């Protein structure tokens, strides 16, 4: 009940008591580990009024514990006040300071996030007075502009009104605010981003006129208070992009690769005090590997290892030549360089992972632990030359949290 | 109770019912996942006679199930025969065919092993008539010669007598049969292999006369029937080694790197039918990354990324140049090439991982599943360009199995 995690590179040992406060479940049992299941049923999100008050009580107690005012008059009165409002309405509303705390601690608790050293530096935009798709668009554009900050990126999140009945739900139908379109061809091959091909079909189903190229920024699909979603185009001056060149290969511009500067996840659920925020897009800055490994070199994403190996003149006959590994390192030297030469914030997988170990140290000290998912923290290349490969990590679910949620087109009662 | 695992690169879905036969525990609960703990307490190994018979019964039933003779006369008589012997002796002895089956299925069940497609092609050497360290040495040398097979390596395992009282235990004190010595210096730096530095001190404590170099093959330390272990030197003609050159860099010989061809783990426990085999060394062939990533480039192993980056003339100033990733891919093109040019069996991390997916397919068909530890299966470089990165895997403990055991010098009642 006082577990220990070791780093088998430095022999550092930390002690985890935080997992005692843990509430939700993991998917594992004593007889089977689910640690490599992508979307476990305990990570996916309808609630009533009986279960609500304990969830509110649990949240309000940790909030007042954090301002060195636990159990005081202001705590007890707010406990009774939310209790009162949950009788009256069978729901309740968070204070501004409560929303900011819950939002930041959802990120803090995100065990698959390697960038959490910044969790306290998060800018919270309260969009809970929004009522239309157009208002959603306005709020999202101000988010994009603010977080982009001319390439000196800044962490932020915009929180739309909380779910209530469940059929009046605010939903961003994009999985990320800025994504490139994906279109299939006659022969079955795919132009653009093969992930978004279904979403691209939906946007044209709603009337998008596609420029049918590679790096075509998708339009937003915004559903407000349960109404059918509407299409909006982020003004291009707000979508910052970095063209990818290499600091050795003058044939790398000829590849003609570029990527948007702002990672901004929009499709997931923010859970605070028992309340569910079905639309809560959040942005930070890219770690190199997310673009140069996953985006560019996944077999079912952009799939460029084929071509980078060609221009490098590599031994592509045999698999054991490691031509794939060799073109993969060049692509990532290139993404990093290209972003860095444009003053656009990016972080390499080595500095990001070192900082996470530093972050883990602080969380075991002033908090008693830090939930972490090794499967997701270790970077997708060069695993064991980074200090997170060698760090034991305890995974557990604390709340406030970010949860996966089903796509709205599989659930939205249409019209 | 009929779980599903998905591959998020090919959309392949397999169905696991095998985990129902699972017995031992994992370390996870419903509220915490231990999936990245290195040596969990459920992976480490003293038993009595009451618990023994169910363990024997469970094993004998699966053995006779596998020869299409389940519950027949030969099964029922052998069930009563082992029952009889467990009354008489409070232990029992495996048939030769039973030892071979249990041994092969321990490997089959090894969830952290990526090379298991070969589990049925395993050569089992019955050493259970051995009584002295010298006999252990003889058996181990014949193992080394056989598995090495002039570089056309062959899987094998040599099984010494089973534990009984627990104080008359057969133990190979080396963690691997062939390992290079590790000696520290005056200034505190380390020559050779920094892992084995404590073992190297023990061997000299027993009287090894060290040549005090880098790649000095360690001598065997063999404990027989609980007696104090004795030193023996594998005849060098039996230790096959591959010097590492690169197929481009004529300065790579100048590095002067070499590695032994035979990976042969000796320190772990084979569990069959309830019986514990405390000495059971097993060998196969190397996957490239185990040498060129972990052995050569771990910070606390050989730590050569420093020097390979120098001769390549790399941007070693800044971390975001990925000079570490770049020297790591060259080292692994080199290990592979060097072994392959000497007809010494090796496998690159790409072909090994593809074959494991193929193996997983067969195990879900003719067995209903396949326990797998994602944390250990994914290779330590280029993770997501290999098909195991994208495969969900269920981990669970089936028996017969290989278990970790404490080092004998922390337990051996000396003299
Ligand atoms: C500030 C810079 C940030 C960096 C460098 C970063 C990096 C990463 C990376 C590499 C992943 C793995 C995802 C993947 O590989 O697809 C991840 C996941 C995640 N991040 Fe962070 N992130 C940042 C900011 C944020 C912010 C602002 C939030 C929320 C407020 C956040 C919450 C999450 C969540 C919820 C996940 C996924 C957890 C899951 O799958 O359940 N991150 N991040
Ligand atoms: C035939 C070629 C083989 C290959 C290519 C191979 C490859 C590997 C690799 C890469 C690992 C991870 C270990 C590490 O990174 O340190 C591993 C682990 C392991 N292998 Fe295999 N191996 C082979 C043969 C065998 C044999 C013959 C046995 C037993 C009869 C075996 C049983 C195991 C076990 C028990 C583990 C570790 C499980 C644990 O940590 O609990 N392997 N193997
Ligand atoms: C703010 C931010 C910064 C950064 N640098 N990176 C990210 C990436 O964060 C996430 C990434 C995903 C990916 C989901 N996954 C992708 C592969 C296939 C299956 C679905 C889901 C999430 F919820 C995330 F927060 C976010
Ligand atoms: C036959 C064989 C072939 C191959 N290609 N490879 C291996 C490596 O197999 C093992 C490797 C280990 C390593 C233990 N670990 C190393 C790092 C630090 C901590 C302890 C433990 C085991 F039991 C193994 F079977 C074995
Ligand atoms: C099968 C496995 O669960 C899946 O591929 C996961 C593995 N770890 C990951 N880690 C990160 N950061 N991102 C991912 O998409 C994944 N995918
Ligand atoms: C902390 C973590 O459990 C540890 O570093 C593990 C991770 N996965 C591994 N995987 C393999 N194949 N070999 C290892 O030594 C390890 N080490
Ligand atoms: Zn688990």
From Swiss-Prot, chains A, B:
Result, substituting residue 286 to H: 50% decrease of nitric-oxide synthase activity
Tissue: Isoform N-NOS-1 is expressed in brain and colorectum. Found in the Auerbach's plexus of the enteric nervous system. Isoform PNNOS is expressed in the penis, urethra, prostate, and skeletal muscle, and coexists with the cerebellar nnos in the pelvic plexus, bladder and liver, and is detectable in the cerebellum.
Binding site for heme b: 113, 404
Annotated compartments: Cell membrane, Sarcolemma; Cell projection, Dendritic spine
Sequence positions that bind (6R)-L-erythro-5,6,7,8-tetrahydrobiopterin: 36, 375-376, 389
Sequence positions that bind L-arginine: 176, 285-286, 290
PTM per Swiss-Prot/TrEMBL: Ubiquitinated; mediated by STUB1/CHIP in the presence of Hsp70 and Hsp40 (in vitro).
Function: Produces nitric oxide (NO) which is a messenger molecule with diverse functions throughout the body. In the brain and peripheral nervous system, NO displays many properties of a neurotransmitter. Inhibitory transmitter for non-adrenergic and non-cholinergic nerves in the colorectum. Probably has nitrosylase activity and mediates cysteine S-nitrosylation of cytoplasmic target proteins such SRR. Inhibitory transmitter for non-adrenergic and non-cholinergic nerves in the colorectum.
Subunit details: Homodimer. Interacts with DLG4 (via N-terminal tandem pair of PDZ domains); the interaction possibly being prevented by the association between NOS1 and CAPON. Forms a ternary complex with CAPON and RASD1. Forms a ternary complex with CAPON and SYN1. Interacts with ZDHHC23. Interacts with NOSIP; which may impair its synaptic location. Interacts with HTR4. Interacts with SLC6A4. Interacts with VAC14.
Comment field on protein domains: The PDZ domain participates in protein-protein interaction, and is responsible for targeting nNos to synaptic membranes. Mediates interaction with VAC14.
Family the entry assigns: Belongs to the NOS family.
The protein's name in its UniProt record: Nitric oxide synthase 1
Species of origin: Rattus norvegicus (Rat)
Name of encoding gene: Nos1
């Amino acid at each position: 009940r006082f577990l220990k995690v070791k780093n088998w590179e430095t022999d550092v040992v930390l002690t985890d008591t935080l997992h005692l406060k843990s509430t939700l479940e993991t998917g594992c049992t004593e007889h089977i580990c689910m640690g490599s299941i992508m979307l476990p049923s305990q990570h996916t999100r309808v609630a009533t009024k009986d279960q609500l008050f304990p969830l509110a009580k649990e949240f309000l107690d940790q909030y007042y514990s954090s301002i060195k005012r636990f159990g005081s008059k202001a705590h007890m009165d707010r406990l009774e006040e939310v209790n009162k409002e949950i009788e009256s309405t069978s729901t309740y509303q968070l204070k501004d300071t409560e929303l900011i705390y819950g939002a930041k601690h959802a990120w803090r608790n995100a065990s698959r996030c390697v960038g959490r050293i910044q969790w306290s530096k998060l800018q919270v935009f309260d969009a809970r007075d929004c009522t239309t798709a157009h208002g959603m668009f306005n709020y999202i554009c101000n988010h994009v502009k603010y977080a982009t900050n001319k390439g000196n990126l800044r962490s932020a999140i915009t929180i739309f009104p909380q779910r209530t009945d469940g059929k009046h739900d605010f939903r961003v139908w994009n999985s990320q605010l800025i994504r490139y379109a994906g279109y299939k061809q006659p022969d079955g091959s795919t132009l653009g981003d093969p992930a978004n091909v279904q979403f691209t079909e939906i946007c044209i189903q709603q009337g998008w006129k596609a420029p049918r190229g590679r790096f075509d920024v998708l339009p937003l699909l915004l559903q407000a208070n349960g109404n059918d979603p509407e299409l909006f185009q982020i003004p291009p001056e707000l979508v910052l992009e970095v063209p990818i060149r290499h600091p050795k290969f003058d044939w790398f511009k000829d590849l003609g690769l570029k990527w948007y500067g702002l990672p901004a996840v929009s499709n997931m659920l923010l859970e605070i005090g028992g309340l569910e925020f079905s639309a809560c897009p959040f942005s930070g800055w890219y770690m190199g590997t997310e673009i140069g490994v996953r985006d560019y070199c996944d077999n079912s994403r952009y799939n460029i290892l084929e071509e980078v190996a060609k221009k490098m003149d590599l031994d592509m006959r045999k698999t054991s030549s490691l031509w794939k590994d060799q073109a993969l390192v060049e692509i990532n030297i290139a993404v990093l360089y290209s972003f860095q030469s444009d003053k656009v914030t990016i972080v390499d997988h080595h500095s990001a992972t070192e900082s996470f170990i530093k972050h883990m140290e602080n969380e075991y000290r002033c908090r008693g632990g830090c939930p972490a998912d090794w499967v997701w923290i270790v970077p997708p290349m060069s695993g064991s030359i980074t200090p997170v490969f060698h760090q034991e990590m305890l995974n557990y679910r604390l709340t406030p949290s970010f949860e996966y949620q089903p796509d709205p087109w599989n659930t939205h009662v249409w019209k």
